[PDB]
Design a protein around this nucleic acid. Structure first.
Ligand code: SF4
Ligand SMILES: O=P([O-])(O)O
Ligand SMILES: O=P([O-])(O)O
Length: 219
DNA sequence: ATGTTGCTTAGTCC
DNA sequence: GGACTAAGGCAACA
């Protein structure tokens, strides 16, 4: 299917009952946003359909993409990620605001699961269900040369996608594995506030990942 | 009030 | 693999 068909069918998806409930249950639970409209639906990917670099996250944040409708938009993860994308020359401007004119250059963003999960922890079954959408979405990204897994969950999801074994591809920040057709699989700590504010992942470390992805992508 | 909640990793143990 | 949790720093939240 094409992208219009993808977005159309993805947004009406309700295969995971626990997530279909959670994505709406969190609406109004955060003080700063009570009374405001929430997307509270599956989140479609965002970015350059001709991207050579794919940044693969974990899932929607309850008050992040689940609220704004755009990956990494409206929370601490995006406040960290978007400025770095611009600093690396991969976007039109530093901030991402729903409904704005932000453009990504050579990069596309999406995640393993597309509906906000309790505790930011989808079950093995929810991962298997949404993996069908990963097949469709990545199927619509023909130019990707570098797949960047943001976190352990994201990597394991990509490994499953590429039919690779966990034992031969452990998760460690900076890890780089070869893929068929001269492509690449890179692993990075996730951009979560839990990682960036605690010091496990710094702005310097992540910009480095982005620069390396550009290098391996011929950008 | 100032204590709690909430935003992955890495290791334990079965 | 699966279930569990200490640790990490900060600040909205209550
Ligand atoms: S997580 Fe994915 S598969 Fe499950 S309901 Fe949401 S879009 Fe559908
Ligand atoms: O809502 P996310 O894309 O920041 O997880
Ligand atoms: O932000 P608070 O401290 O007024 O609740």
């Amino acid at each position: 299917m094409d992208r219009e068909a993808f977005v159309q069918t993805l947004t009406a998806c309700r295969l995971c009952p626990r997530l279909v409930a959670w994505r709406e249950e969190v609406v109004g639970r955060k003080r700063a946003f009570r009374g405001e409209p929430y997307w509270a639906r599956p989140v479609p990917g965002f970015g350059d359909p001709e991207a050579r670099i794919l940044l693969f996250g974990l899932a929607p944040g309850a008050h992040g993409s689940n609220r704004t409708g755009r990956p990494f938009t409206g929370d601490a993860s995006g406040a960290f990620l978007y400025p770095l994308l611009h600093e690396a020359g991969l976007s039109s401007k530093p901030e991402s605001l729903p409904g704005d004119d932000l453009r990504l250059y050579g990069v596309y963003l999406t995640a393993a699961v597309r509906c906000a999960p309790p505790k930011n922890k989808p079950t093995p079954e929810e991962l298997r269900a949404c993996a069908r959408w990963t097949e469709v979405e990545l199927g619509l990204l023909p130019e990707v040369r570098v797949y960047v897994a943001l976190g352990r969950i994201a990597l394991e999801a990509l490994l499953a996608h590429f039919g690779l074994r966990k034992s031969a591809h452990p998760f460690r920040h900076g890890a780089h594995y070869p893929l068929p057709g001269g492509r690449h699989l890179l692993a990075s700590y996730h951009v979560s506030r839990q990682n960036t504010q605690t010091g496990r992942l710094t702005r310097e470390m992540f910009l480095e990942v982005l620069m390396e992805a550009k290098r391996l992508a011929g950008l």
